[PDB]
Write a protein that binds this DNA or RNA. Sequence first.
DNA 1: CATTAGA
DNA 2: TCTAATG
Length: 327
Amino acid sequence: ETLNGGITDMLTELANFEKNVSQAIHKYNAYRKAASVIAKYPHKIKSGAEAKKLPGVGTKIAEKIDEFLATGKLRKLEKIRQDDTSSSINFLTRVSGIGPSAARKFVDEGIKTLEDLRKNEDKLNHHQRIGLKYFGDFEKRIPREEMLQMQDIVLNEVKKVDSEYIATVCGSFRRGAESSGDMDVLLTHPSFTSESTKQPKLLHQVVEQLQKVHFITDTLSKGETKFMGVCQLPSKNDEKEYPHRRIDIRLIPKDQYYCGVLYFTGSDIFNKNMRAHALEKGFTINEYTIRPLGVTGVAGEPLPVDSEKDIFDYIQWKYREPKDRSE
DNA sequence: CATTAGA
DNA sequence: TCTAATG
Ligand SMILES: [Mn+2]
Ligand SMILES: [Mn+2]
Ligand code: NA
Ligand code: NA
């Protein structure tokens, strides 16, 4: 956690580089397990050989471990960091919609800067264009204070549309968080569950409403169950217009709402930890259900969940407010 | 690990 | 169809 801090960090620096700049899933995969292992190890790695004993660490990495232990730096790491080609990628990759693959390609064609990207908006698909457009606003965090106004709105339309809808803004926002990166709204409806062959409009009508009033200003991707767009709080009585925010809305078969809600409320840790406990307590949890465990090794049969509680009760835990689902 | 765009 | 990119 700090005892092997640099080691794991340099390791991941290295991994990440293989995957993005290079397309070496293997080495890239290599750096990763090593990094995973040395991280666990309970003692201060004092040399490559010591490290070497570890599963995943071989000669290649052991050698890096040394140079780093001796000189508080690393060649390849100095080399890479400097490398403009590789920096370029690490940068373009910041555009929503641009991933490594496209970053490489662009770069090759010589598009390295944001500006290059502008002069060449033509080579960019919708997502990435919108991504390019709001690059600035997309990088900004969401002051909770705004999150509240946003939530406040979405709820009203959702409802105005059909009183039946149930919406819950999940995420860190949910968990108290002072600011969030983007807004996740989980939605479901009684007339939509596990069997009942969809009702795509269900998702569609809200979107349309939301757009109707100008909260959604753009669409990145809309499917029959998961809409991914951009929103904005009405720039009041001018002088202060609000930054463009990322928003995601997803339809859930009402029968698996809370499971989802549980899940997207995180945190990653609260999750696992919740997950591991349900295991002892003879079950299993996942993005959509909780199935009692049978002794034959495994077992199924989706228990009936009516609120976040039921999940709790099932695994027989203490209902933990979202506020404390921090780990 | 699943849902969407795109070509 | 596959393959990229988000989360
Ligand atoms: Mn989020
Ligand atoms: Mn999200
Ligand atoms: Na070994
Ligand atoms: Na990106």
